[PDB]
UniProtKB/Swiss-Prot annotation:
Top-rank lineage group of the source organism: Eukaryota
First-to-last residue of the parent protein present: 571 to 650 of 650
Organism from which the protein derives: Homo sapiens (Human)
Name assigned to this protein: FAS-associated factor 1
Assembly mode: Interacts with CDT1 and ATPase VCP/p97. Interacts (via UBA domain) with FAS (via death domain). Interacts (via UBA domain) with NLRP12 (via DAPIN/PYRIN domain).
Tissue specificity annotation: Most abundant in testis, slightly less abundant in skeletal muscle and heart, followed by prostate, thymus, ovary, small intestine, and colon. Not detected in the peripheral blood leukocytes.
Upper lineage: Eukaryota, Metazoa, Chordata, Craniata, Vertebrata
Domain UBX: 2-77
């Protein structure tokens, strides 16, 4: 058994992208997922619950566990200006 992070990512219009990730995965892997769905890290913020933080500004080589995106997180996509 390993720790898993369950992520839900809300698109600007209100639909949800969902994937489970090993908590050991690097954040890059989460960036890859959103990119794959049309919402790349360089174009869209990934906003967390309070305290608010944009996960696209974190170190992409850090694990989900290290950046505290575990075990369940809903993130909101928002276009970068």
């Amino acid at each position: 058994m390993e720790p898993v992070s369950k992520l839900r990512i809300r698109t600007p219009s209100g639909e949800f992208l969902e994937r489970r990730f090993l908590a050991s995965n690097k954040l890059q892997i989460v960036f890859d997922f959103v990119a794959s769905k049309g919402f790349p890290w360089d174009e869209y913020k990934l906003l967390s619950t309070f305290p608010r933080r944009d996960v696209t500004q974190l170190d992409p080589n850090k694990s989900l566990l290290e950046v505290k995106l575990f075990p369940q997180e809903t993130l909101f996509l928002e276009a970068k200006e």
